[PDB]
């Protein structure tokens, strides 16, 4: 239904090694499709997905061009902030950029993003209306005042509402047989006894795409939240995802708990209950 | 596609 495209830029100064490390990547939904790494041989934007390879060489040229510009703007940015935060040239600092856009099932614009971070904190970001900036502190107030005078908002907006969206739609069609797929989770439950007293019920969801899932435990059909462990959704390596939820349980009361699984690939949600 | 607009901070 909903879809996104997002580019992610990280640049980290290597004082002494001079040239800062710069890595850019690009995603459609939860599938990565392009990368650029300042330390790689190719010095071009590389493909990280079959479907984008079909794009012709005008494309690859044009993205390599743009990404180099990104790399440049960041190398400079690193120094600018160094001075704004009155820091010295002996420490390694990190600048991060993220932008992209989102569309409904209609494939129309919903939201756009443009945001910066310096050393793991917010720096500056474009508000949701894409007409104005949020300056995280005093330092970034300076970048705000500048980008206001230079009518940056208006332009970036037009990219995010316009260009960004069209390219997503294209990527989606071109990668229809991958990006537009709904891989429903394979689900099982396991039982491991810690004592004669308690026992752990673990509810699994494997081989699913996209990564957006929900697993909740329900005691007697009431949301049981308390004696609960829930691992971070994790990537399986082959483009699918994994998650599990756990409840430790008074033994004899095993069939009092049910695992509930919601995912876009399932017609109806799933209810799973330990079967011996 | 990346954007064509890039501004320094």
């Amino acid at each position, epitope marked *: 239904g909903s879809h996104s495209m997002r580019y992610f830029f990280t640049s980290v100064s290597r004082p002494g090694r001079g040239e800062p490390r710069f890595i850019a990547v690009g995603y459609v939904d939860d599938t990565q499709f392009v990368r650029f790494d300042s330390d790689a041989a190719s010095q071009r934007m590389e493909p990280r997905a079959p479907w984008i390879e079909q794009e012709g060489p005008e494309y690859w040229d044009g993205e390599t*061009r743009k990404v180099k510009a990104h790399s*440049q703007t960041h190398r400079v940015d690193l120094g600018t902030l160094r001075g704004y935060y009155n820091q010295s040239e002996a420490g390694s600092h990190t600048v991060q950029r993220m932008y992209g856009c989102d569309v409904g099932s209609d494939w129309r614009f919903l939201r756009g993003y443009h945001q910066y971070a310096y050393d793991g904190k917010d720096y500056i970001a474009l508000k949701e209306d894409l007409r104005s900036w949020t300056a995280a502190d005093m330092a970034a107030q300076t970048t705000k005042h500048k980008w206001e005078a*230079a*009518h940056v908002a208006e*332009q970036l907006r037009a990219y995010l*509402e*316009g260009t960004c969206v069209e390219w997503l739609r294209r990527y989606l069609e071109n990668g229809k047989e991958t990006l537009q797929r709904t891989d429903a989770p394979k689900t099982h439950m396991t039982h491991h006894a810690v004592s004669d007293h308690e026992a752990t019920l673990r509810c699994w969801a494997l081989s699913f795409y996209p990564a957006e899932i929900t697993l909740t435990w329900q005691r007697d059909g009431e949301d049981q939240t308390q004696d609960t462990e829930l691992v971070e959704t994790r990537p399986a390596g082959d483009g699918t995802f994994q998650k599990w939820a756990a409840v430790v349980v008074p033994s004899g009361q095993e069939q009092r708990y049910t695992c509930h699984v919601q995912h876009e690939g399932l017609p109806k949600p799933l209810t799973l209950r330990w079967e011996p | 596609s990346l954007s064509n607009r*890039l501004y320094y901070l």
Partner: T-cell receptor
Amino acid sequence: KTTQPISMDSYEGQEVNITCSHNHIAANDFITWYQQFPSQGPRFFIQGYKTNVSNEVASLFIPADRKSSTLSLPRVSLSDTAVYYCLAWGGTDMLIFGTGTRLQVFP
Amino acid sequence: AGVAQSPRYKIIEKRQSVAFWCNPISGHGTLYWYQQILGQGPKLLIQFHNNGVVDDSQLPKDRFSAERLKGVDSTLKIQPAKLEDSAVYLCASSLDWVGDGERQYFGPGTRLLVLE
């Protein structure tokens, strides 16, 4: 891509109107016109965005939907005889000049 | 202020070397080499910012090459030349190659004619 007439003739003292065609213009792209005289390099002439613009050398009429644009030399001199290139681009984007429109101003 | 290039004209035999020179506007950090085949407009060959190549994806590396080792004057060079390289070689400079869209300042060209 811009698309424009290959050549255009005119008499001195008239208003001249060259039409650029840019239907697949990107939403942040600007409309920009270089002028090249014979045996010189191209020089920047007029640039516009989304609202009509006129400097002290020409006028750029830009419709709302920006599928086409029109350059308007107000009253041509023989000295205005030159190629007029029309670009629709922005920021870090290559210039793609094309064929231009060779204007000729007869006396 | 204008961009300067040397020379204005150059006649050369097939398979020989030739070299154009350009001095950008003082301060302009991005320089460009274009090729203008007769009756077309200029197409980009190579783009420098300071002393480094930002774009060369379209340059014929078999024969063309360029330099801007101090980030100011530049030198484009064909070797060995072919007949079809007969063109005007234009040079341009920009303050930067990023932002809203930067106006380019061109030099007056070097006319190259390669003969059999």
